[PDB]
Amino acid sequence: GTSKLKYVLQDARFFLIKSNNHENVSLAKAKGVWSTLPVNEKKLNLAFRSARSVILIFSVRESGKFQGFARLSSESHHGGSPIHWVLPAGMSAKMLGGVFKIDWICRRELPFTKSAHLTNPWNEHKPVKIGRDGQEIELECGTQLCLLFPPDESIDLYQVIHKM
């Protein structure tokens, strides 16, 4: 069903995450973590304090799809086990900020062809697939985008609801 999903998404904030490679999203799905540049880290930490749920919606660059979405379960923190992110070309992971813990809500993919009717008011009403890493997606667009994903019957939102 979709009722617990709609409960989690109620009055949530949504952010577009653009990964340069599939390996970082695989690592995120396996470890329940994400890391981003400080400019986005600050935005996400502000949002985490201000909203019932902060949803990251993931897209691998050039893949033509979203790879799933997840809910922040903490602000960013430093000093955990290192995460062996792949950076594009030979760039340093030092550029990254803290680590956010995340609970996955959907690990299934959604092709951009299925979201072509959704525009994001906070990015000039361009299609929601279009946007820089960290672009905020307005509430209604973000909710409809999440509801387009195939149901992920491996996930139980009961434990996510309790963290709200």
Ligand SMILES: CNC(=O)c1n[nH]c2ccc(Br)cc12
């Ligand atoms: C695991 N997260 C990343 O790899 C990442 N997040 N935002 C970025 C901006 C530029 C570069 Br290069 C890499 C990233």
